[PDB]
Design a binder for these strands. Structure first.
Lengths: 131, 135
RNA sequence: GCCGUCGAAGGUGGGACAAAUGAUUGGGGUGAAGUCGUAACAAGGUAGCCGUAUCGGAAGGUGCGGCUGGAUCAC
RNA sequence: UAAUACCGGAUAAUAUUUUGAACCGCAUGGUUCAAAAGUGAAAGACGGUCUUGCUGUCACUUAUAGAUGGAUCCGCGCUGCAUUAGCUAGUUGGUAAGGUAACGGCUUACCAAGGCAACGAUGCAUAGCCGACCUGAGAGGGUGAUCGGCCACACUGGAACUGAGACACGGUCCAGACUCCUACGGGAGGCAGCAGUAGGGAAUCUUCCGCAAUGGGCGAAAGCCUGACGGAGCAACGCCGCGUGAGUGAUGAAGGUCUUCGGAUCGUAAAACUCUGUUAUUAGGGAAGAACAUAUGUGUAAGUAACUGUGCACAUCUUGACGGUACCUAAUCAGAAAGCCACGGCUAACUACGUGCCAGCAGCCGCGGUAAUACGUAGGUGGCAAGCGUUAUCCGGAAUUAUUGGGCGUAAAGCGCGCGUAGGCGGUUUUUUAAGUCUGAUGUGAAAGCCCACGGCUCAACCGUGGAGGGUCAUUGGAAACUGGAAAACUUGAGUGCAGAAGAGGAAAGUGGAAUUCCAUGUGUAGCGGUGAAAUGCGCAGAGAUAUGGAGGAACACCAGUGGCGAAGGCGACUUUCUGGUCUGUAACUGACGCUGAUGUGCGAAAGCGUGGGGAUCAAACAGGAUUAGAUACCCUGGUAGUCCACGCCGUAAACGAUGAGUGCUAAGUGUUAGGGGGUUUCCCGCCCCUUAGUGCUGCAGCUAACGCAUUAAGCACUCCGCCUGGGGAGUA
């Protein structure tokens, strides 16, 4: 069973990191779409794209590798995984590698990045660590 | 392990057992109640003394003795150290110690303060060996 | 003051765990020696797993089943 | 013989029971108003004014309170053991009684059968509880000294009087002892109060004082007692703090110590000088403060003919066990005052010597054999000190639980493999919810410690002060991402849908075969026979052998392979039985229907075995019997439980990949086993390539101690199972 979307998303991202290619697509979710937009905002994904097809539309990512096809980011991992519904309140917000390392957090309104998290000070279910 | 089975389990450690069965007086002298007293010392007598022989090349003849402390629990214990003036059924203080001489024993007598008197000719017994500062 | 509810405590009898003990039996090894047993060739020797059984006192072997296994070792 | 002792009675209400009324709540009901009978009682004390009124001041009694505390109930946490699985009958619930503050089996009688039980009741061990504390960066772990409170107990059991409250730590009764003593007739006692005793223990502190300080009990008070507590008193028991000399003085004195013989060497150490009185010694101060206290006497608000009497805070007085303390001053000298551990290293520090693998040392490596910086001695050094070292234990370490922070490719670990209950987690999208979640507000986290700051104590130690911290508590503000619901559907997963492809899968049944073995018949020897010799054992009447003939039972010559089925065990002669499974494509469409899976639980090598048959081999044991007193030991010969048929017991193994399952991702090369497609061509079957789903070999990356895997990961991740905790002891008890 594909238990968690975050897990497969991030393991295939790390797989592409190893294989050093950018254009990859995957069946999304609305949350996957929004976090991919956050990725392009962060930049290390040069481009993201979303369409619709069975069942959720395929999210289409196009990474921003380094100048020599290096990971601009360093590390990446899920946090909220099956069984572990793990939440963080305003002060419980973590700072992987401070500002450099980042993490979106789902909050009472939606998914927001670590900067947004400690900025608007609404905690929530911490999602996944990327650094 | 999986989170659920981790929950329905304590993940127990491998907690040891004290290889020194030092069950000191505790409730021995009332109700004969077994009591894990950890005392560093109990008073008691070595009812018998003996001497097993070591093998070659180091024929460092080591001497043993079977002893009862305040709890009066049987054990054959070796004597270390040079010099003594005690004999059968002499009161002796035994400290916890396991040495390379012989299995079946994990304790050892101490010199200086009881029937197994130490020697004050050396300087190592300045603070120990039961004997006072060699003055 | 009596009786009646309960009534410890306490004992009695039926047994249960029982607890050390242990009736006598059994098992073993044992030849000092009481049997007396001879006194010939002394062994023509063997060898990579596990479970399980049938013996071998055992030492092992017949094994049945299927084979994972990880030569020696020095100063 | 008096009481404020006792019993009456008068009165009385929110007091009982009923009367009615209104309001209202959760169902029980609660709130308020108006009705019946009922008895409240200190003619008390003691002051005053002054009548003795009058109140004073308490007490009395009554109702209403507050408040206090207690009780009771509930939620959540609240120790180990399941080699701890059933508990269970006033128990379950109600009925009526009673009974208590209430509550109800709470207990009676009723009727009824409950009620709990793996999410671990029950049982056992054990245990005071927590706050708190110790180690740990923390996480955590561990602990539970005094101190805060809460609980339990007071020789033992059974009670009960009392009183607001005890079934009463220093009431009682009884009985049981126990023990003690008696005139023996029966009387008497109970330190898990405090010292202390005896003993025990390694030993733990006065058979110390006081009530100075508070803290009560009782009053108005003095006061009583205070083993609370305060205080001093012991245990370098624990920290903290002063020194146990500093400065000078080199000359490397002398001398210890080595030495190569010079020198160093102790060592600015010495001598000597200069200081300190720290520390200690003494004469004093203070024996601080703590001391506020108890009430009295002072005039001032409530009221009284009358602050009369009072009552408020003020006048004014009153208290030392510590102790004639701490601490401080006059002086006292370097002069009292300090050591100990280690030096192979680990870890700081070594050489000389005597010593002789011996003594020995010994925490680890191990040293010591005459030669040791590992024994001892001297020096020298180090570390450290009012202490040092040893031991007992907790954690760090020890991440040695591995949530943080382990594996199971092999050092320890994947049942043997299943089905599946609960449960674990949960696909895409649309709303609500706010349960969570997040996100504040509230109340509320004794105190102390706790961290921070700060005050005092010379300082430290230390208390104190405040802050901080401190809930996983309840409540409400948002919120709807997420999980969880609620609703709505979508689909490929799942479903199932159609087309196919697919088979040692299963179990039943039958069919064949070569042939173990036996044996029929016929022929045929002389030996077979196993060996070292053979023995034996077979056997001249035919063994061994033959060819013709069967029997029984046996598993099925090739294929056979990483073929395959399986989840494994295992599954291959053929066939069928009536089914189980395999996949290509398929998307057929409800709409997550899924997930692994504690318990449970089926299936399952062999042997063994129960039974009932067979026995064809084979075959332990076995014996004949080599061998050798012994010979089963083995080499024989035959035969042998059973193997083999029926079911159970068997459930175990190398069932091993010691690779749980599923998920999906991720270079390649490069096959397979079935598929499919496209083009390629005559069937492209021929080719290629794309994937379907597995099973390869090499190898990217990755990772492993290494080994190697590496799309089928041992790479990456995810829900769900079990194990592992040195070896082994012992899979054994």
């Amino acid at each position: 069973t594909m238990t968690d979307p975050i897990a497969d998303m991030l393991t295939r991202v790390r797989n592409a990191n190893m294989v050093r290619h950018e254009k990859l697509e995957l069946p999304a979710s609305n949350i996957k779409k929004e976090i991919a937009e956050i990725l392009k905002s962060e930049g290390f994904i040069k481009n993201v794209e979303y369409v619709e097809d069975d069942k959720q539309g395929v999210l289409r990512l196009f990474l921003k590798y380094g100048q020599n096809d290096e990971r601009v980011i360093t590390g990446l991992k899920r946090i909220s995984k099956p069984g572990l519904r793990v939440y963080a309140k305003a002060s419980e917000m973590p700072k992987v590698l401070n500002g450099l390392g980042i993490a979106l957090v789902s909050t009472s309104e939606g998914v927001i990045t670590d900067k947004e998290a400690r900025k608007r000070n609404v905690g929530g279910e911490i999602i996944a660590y990327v650094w | 392990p999986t989170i659920n089975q981790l929950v329905r389990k304590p993940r127990q450690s491998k907690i040891k057992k004290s290889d020194s069965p030092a069950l000191n007086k505790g409730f021995n002298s009332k109700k004969k109640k077994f009591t894990d007293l950890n005392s560093p010392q109990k008073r008691g007598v070595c009812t018998r003394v003996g001497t097993m022989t070591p093998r070659k090349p180091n024929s460092a003849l080591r001497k043993y003795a079977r002893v009862r402390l305040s709890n009066n629990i049987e054990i054959n214990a070796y004597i270390p150290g040079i010099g003594h003036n005690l004999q059968e059924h002499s009161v002796v203080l035994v400290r916890g110690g396991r040495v390379r001489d012989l299995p079946g024993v994990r304790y050892h007598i101490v010199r200086g303060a009881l029937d197994t008197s130490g020697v004050d000719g050396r300087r190592q017994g300045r603070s120990l060996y039961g004997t006072k500062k060699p003055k």
